[PDB]
Amino acid sequence: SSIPGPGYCMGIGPLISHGRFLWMGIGSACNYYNRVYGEFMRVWISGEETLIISKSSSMFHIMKHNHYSSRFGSKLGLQCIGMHEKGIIFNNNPELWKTTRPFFMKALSGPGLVRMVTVCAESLKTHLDRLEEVTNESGYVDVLTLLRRVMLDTSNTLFLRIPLDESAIVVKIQGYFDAWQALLIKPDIFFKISWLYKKYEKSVKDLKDAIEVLIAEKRRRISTEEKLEECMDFATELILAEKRGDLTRENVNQCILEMLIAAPDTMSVSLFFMLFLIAKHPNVEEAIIKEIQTVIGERDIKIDDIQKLKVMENFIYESMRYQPVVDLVMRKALEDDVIDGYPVKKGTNIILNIGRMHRLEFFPKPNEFTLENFAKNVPYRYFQPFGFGPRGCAGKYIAMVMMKAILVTLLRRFHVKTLQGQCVESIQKIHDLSLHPDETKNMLEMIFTPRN
Ligand code: HEM
Ligand SMILES: C[C@]12CCC(=O)C=C1CC[C@@H]1[C@@H]2CC[C@]2(C)C(=O)CC[C@@H]12
Incomplete structure (x- = not known):
């Protein structure tokens, strides 16, 4: 199979795509090109041909193998x-x-x-x-x-x-x-x-x-x-x-x-993002609070507790799936390979669009925030919030521990309120290297009101 993507207009093709990336930001440009062209397509950043891929099968191949253990x-x-x-x-x-x-x-x-x-x-x-x-x-x-x-x-x-x-x-x-x-x-x-x-x-x-x-x-x-x-x-x-x-x-x-x-x-x-989601999903908040009461009580949080916090685990997973921060992973091909159907030469850059992947591939209700998306055991070949394999997130396990620990100790003590009608969906976001709030805008504050 040949490679989908914009035409190489005798050296104008590369300049428009790079320009688009610089103007839009890496993230939004990735989502643009996957929407217009295929879920596996070709662009240029500087000289180098760079592939932007949202296909789970492609994702899995790339992170599994040692000859992609590079970025660019x-x-x-x-x-x-x-x-x-x-x-x-x-x-x-x-x-x-x-x-x-x-x-x-x-x-x-x-x-x-x-x-x-x-x-x-x-x-x-x-x-x-x-x-x-x-x-x-x-x-x-x-x-x-x-x-x-x-x-x-x-x-x-x-x-x-x-x-x-x-x-x-x-x-x-x-x-x-x-x-x-x-x-x-x-x-x-x-x-x-x-x-x-x-x-x-x-x-x-x-x-x-x-x-x-x-x-x-x-x-x-x-x-x-x-x-x-x-x-x-x-x-x-x-x-x-x-x-x-x-x-x-x-x-x-x-x-x-x-x-x-x-x-x-x-x-x-x-x-x-997780705290803003709690503020706007009171039913999910109740489940979390009841789980804290059941598992922890008023004891200090301990390592043995973290496995037991299943509802919160699913909340963290769903928040990351629905509203990601790290929605894209940058890689490079170190050896030649054929991936799915397409040829991938060494030196080819890869951007895995995991944010878009999590809205296309496995989940029952992909375009809405629900713990129903995690009601059944999710195969790690369809959900990759951290990456896996030889170059997956180094902190992938500790991150889950940390996120649980701070959510427990915060929500134990405070109800979280959002200002006006503000939610994760209404926040003005920068979508470049990561997906984060534009901090030049306001209304990003919260109100912490005590519990009991
Ligand atoms: C919710 C929080 C986090 C998210 C969503 C996240 C996600 C990711 C992702 C998707 C990658 C790319 C992996 C790949 O190429 O397959 C990565 C890489 C990495 N992460 Fe995280 N991560 C998080 C927290 C952390 C923490 C807490 C640490 C350590 C304090 C950490 C350290 C690293 C390092 C060092 C890499 C580069 C790994 C390499 O290239 O060998 N991460 N992370
Ligand atoms: C997780 C991370 C590292 C720790 C840190 O300090 C901040 C970030 C955010 C950008 C991540 C990066 C790791 C490598 C990632 C996945 C890419 O290949 C493109 C975006 C980028």
């Missing part, structure tokens, strides 16, 4: 943000990615996952006691800021544990994400004119310098530690691996940064 993006963009062959997220060097990933995998499962449930709860408790930091005169809570601050505090106390300026680093992480999202698919021409990206360069430096202060302190505490194996964490694991010569200092520093930004970037927006 502007070399100049990735060098600017420090992700070019340095972290794991957009580390496209297969061998360097292979040797860096285990550090993330170990920290995000096993005992660290068990510690996280209680770390999350305590971190949210402490911030819910300090609601004055985040609440308006008219009682409006800045939930986005609240969630970002707990997510950072959570990540720090588990993976690094060095005291930091919580409020400042949060703003800096937001700055970093903007830079990341801005520069990721900009053409090489964009980087020639310097009064057009130096804005983002400063944002990257702001965060990287701030994290440097923290890693420097961490390095000192490690060198003067008696019981070194008694208090191991993610940052220490990397620093010792560097000392063995397995890792580069620059690489270590990017890993720590990537670990710290991950939850503030994705978890907080996800939980925000």
Whole structure:
């Protein structure tokens, strides 16, 4: 089979599609092209032929196999943000990615996952006691800021544990994400004119310098530690691996940064959407509250509770299915292969449109929010909110633990109200690297009213 998509109009075909991606944003452009052309089609970003695919069968093949364990993006963009062959997220060097990933995998499962449930709860408790930091005169809570601050505090106390300026680093992480999202698919021409990206360069430096202060302190505490194996964490694991010569200092520093930004970037927006959904679905709220009463009572949340929280689990799954944040996954072909019916040469970029896939393929009621979509056991080959296989979400299991832990401890204490008629559907969204609220708009606040 030949490949669907717009015509290569003697070099105008590539320029319109790239231009469309730059104007619309990656996400919306992906949804445009899948709607106009097939659910498996071809576009160009820069020179390279890039495939945009929403087919579940294609999705499954790509994530299953090792020869897709790469992403893509502007070399100049990735060098600017420090992700070019340095972290794991957009580390496209297969061998360097292979040797860096285990550090993330170990920290995000096993005992660290068990510690996280209680770390999350305590971190949210402490911030819910300090609601004055985040609440308006008219009682409006800045939930986005609240969630970002707990997510950072959570990540720090588990993976690094060095005291930091919580409020400042949060703003800096937001700055970093903007830079990341801005520069990721900009053409090489964009980087020639310097009064057009130096804005983002400063944002990257702001965060990287701030994290440097923290890693420097961490390095000192490690060198003067008696019981070194008694208090191991993610940052220490990397620093010792560097000392063995397995890792580069620059690489270590990017890993720590990537670990710290991950939850503030994705978890907080996800939980925000989840909280807006609770506010507008009172029947679903009741089920969750009754489940909390049955399973937990007024005991502290524990690791043994998380499996039992089935209703909430289904809620989290449905929220992610219906209103995703990470609705697209970027990959690259490392070997030639035939996929479904189409030829896919090595060096071909892939964008998997998982958001659209979750509205087309398996679910009974795809275009409405219902826990009925998860009333029967969902095959993981039709629902992929995290990705799977050798390059699936490193935090995929811990993320479920964290989301449960904070939803339990928040809803236990407060009823959530939305301002005016606002819902996830009415929120003005940016649909670029991720699907998130346009924060230049207002009416994003909530009202937290006590329970009992
Ligand atoms: C609701 C929250 C989250 C969602 C929806 C999410 C989703 C995803 C998805 C779809 C990917 C791409 C996987 C693929 O290519 O198949 C990814 C990658 C990744 N995630 Fe998450 N994730 C979440 C939370 C987290 C957390 C809490 C962490 C760690 C603190 C994390 C760390 C990572 C890392 C390091 C990668 C890059 C993996 C690699 O390229 O090897 N994620 N995530
Ligand atoms: C989950 C994630 C990493 C942790 C973080 O800090 C923020 C994000 C949001 C963008 C994700 C990314 C992982 C890689 C993804 C799936 C892509 O291939 C395109 C969009 C992108």
